[PDB]
Amino acid sequence: PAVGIDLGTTYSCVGVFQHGKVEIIANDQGNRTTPSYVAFTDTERLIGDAAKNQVAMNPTNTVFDAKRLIGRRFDDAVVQSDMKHWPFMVVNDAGRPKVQVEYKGETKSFYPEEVSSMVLTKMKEIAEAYLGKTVTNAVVTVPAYFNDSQRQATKDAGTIAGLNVLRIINEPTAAAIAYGLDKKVGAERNVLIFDLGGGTFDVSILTIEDGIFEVKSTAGDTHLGGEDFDNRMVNHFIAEFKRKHKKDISENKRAVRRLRTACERAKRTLSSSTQASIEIDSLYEGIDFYTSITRARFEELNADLFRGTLDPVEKALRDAKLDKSQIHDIVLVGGSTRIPKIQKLLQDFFNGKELNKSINPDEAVAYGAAVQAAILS
Numbered sequence: 001p002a003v004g005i006d007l008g009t010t011y012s013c014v015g016v017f018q019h020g021k022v023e024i025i026a027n028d029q030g031n032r033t034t035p036s037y038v039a040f041t042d043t044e045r046l047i048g049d050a051a052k053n054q055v056a057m058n059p060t061n062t063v064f065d066a067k068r069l070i071g072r073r074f075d076d077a078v079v080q081s082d083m084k085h086w087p088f089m090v091v092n093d094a095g096r097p098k099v100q101v102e103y104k105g106e107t108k109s110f111y112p113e114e115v116s117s118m119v120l121t122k123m124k125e126i127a128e129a130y131l132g133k134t135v136t137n138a139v140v141t142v143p144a145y146f147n148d149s150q151r152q153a154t155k156d157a158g159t160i161a162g163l164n165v166l167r168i169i170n171e172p173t174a175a176a177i178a179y180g181l182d183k184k185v186g187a188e189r190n191v192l193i194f195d196l197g198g199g200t201f202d203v204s205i206l207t208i209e210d211g212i213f214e215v216k217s218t219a220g221d222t223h224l225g226g227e228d229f230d231n232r233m234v235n236h237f238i239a240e241f242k243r244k245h246k247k248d249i250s251e252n253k254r255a256v257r258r259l260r261t262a263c264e265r266a267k268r269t270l271s272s273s274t275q276a277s278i279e280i281d282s283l284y285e286g287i288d289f290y291t292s293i294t295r296a297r298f299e300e301l302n303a304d305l306f307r308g309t310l311d312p313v314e315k316a317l318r319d320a321k322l323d324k325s326q327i328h329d330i331v332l333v334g335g336s337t338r339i340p341k342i343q344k345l346l347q348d349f350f351n352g353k354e355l356n357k358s359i360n361p362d363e364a365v366a367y368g369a370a371v372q373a374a375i376l377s
């Protein structure tokens with residue numbers, strides 16, 4: 001048995017190719033993704049949903065976004081910039097960063113591959129729990145733009161987990177293989193992979209000829225995703241509250257939370273029907289917030305951000321010296337591409353051209369890694 005693991009920034013996912021069909025193994029909690037979270041608490045260490053869920057109670061010893069630190073040096077523009085926004089401690093141990101935590105009363109320090117080895121250990125377990133066998137061999141994916149150092153730090157992060165990493169594979173190639181774009185014959189095809197998750201955005205252009213892949217260019221926005229979209233809604237509703245009820249709820253962390261949470265959920269609903277209702281009882285100072293939102297209004301709150309996504313598309317076409325009519329295939333991954341106006345912009349931008357999207361976008365990377373781990377098996 002060999003697995004494909006999509007090791008992501010916010011979530012990880014693990015799959016196995018069995019009985020001629022891929023299976024996205026579910027966790028001990030029944031979820032097909034597992035947050036890449038690791039908490040340290042007085043008595044135990046927590047990974048996945050257990051860690052995600054006590055992040056309010058222990059925000060200072062609950063680590064996440066370790067993919068943003070992996071393989072980088074302490075002075076990397078990105079280690080520096082992100083550090084400002086993490087409750088936990090990032091520490092310069094001799095030019096290489098470390099996360100230091102409180103864990104059983106003793107303060108311990110951790111390299112990022114140590115912290116990614118824990119997510120990988122858990123994913124290994126998730127599979128071994130499902131398959132009722134030992135799992136060792138894996139494919140683990142990384143973004144196309146990762147360098148040697150960051151590939152090595154990931155590969156090690158697995159070798160530490162007890163994994164036999166058969167291969168490290170680019171996420172947009174994982175998704176290409178998922179869609180069997182690598183079994184098309186004859187002439188070289190150019191493939192654009194649009195990855196829009198919750199917090200990060202990545203465009204990747206690859207050429208594929210005869211099932212041999214090559215990375216042509218990299219683009220993206222490293223702080224754009226579904227979360228910017230929920231914020232647009234939170235502002236629309238906070239204004240709407242102030243209107244009808246002349247109150248400002250925004251300095252009440254809990255009212256805003258109840259609202260955020262209802263906004264992300266409403267957002268998901270708007271990808272499949274044309275409006276979405278919200279009732280939040282006694283939201284602020286005793287007042288009920290009963291409201292509703294159409295898709296068209298949601299689209300308008302985000303109209304600039306939805307378009308803004310086409311720039312990494314252009315900028316990546318630039319750097320790959322390709323005209324948009326030369327793109328043979330478009331592949332959508334990351335759970336935000338489920339938003340229809342986003343698919344509509346992209347289809348219309350690429351002059352009516354179809355989109356490859358039938359595989360679950362959250363899962364497609366892990367799908368292709370598992371398909372591929374099977375061949376290398």
Ligand SMILES: N#Cc1ccc(COC[C@H]2O[C@@H](n3c(NCc4ccc(Cl)c(Cl)c4)nc4c(N)ncnc43)[C@H](O)[C@@H]2O)cc1
Binds near residue numbers: 335
């Ligand atoms: N269980 C679970 C689970 C699985 C994957 C993810 C990751 O999602 C990353 C981003 O993708 C966004 N998103 C997602 N994410 C997938 C998802 C599916 C179910 C649940 Cl309960 C959750 Cl909450 C998230 N679906 C969207 C949709 N249908 N329309 C618009 N946006 C969608 C989501 O809001 C988030 O911002 C998050 C949760």
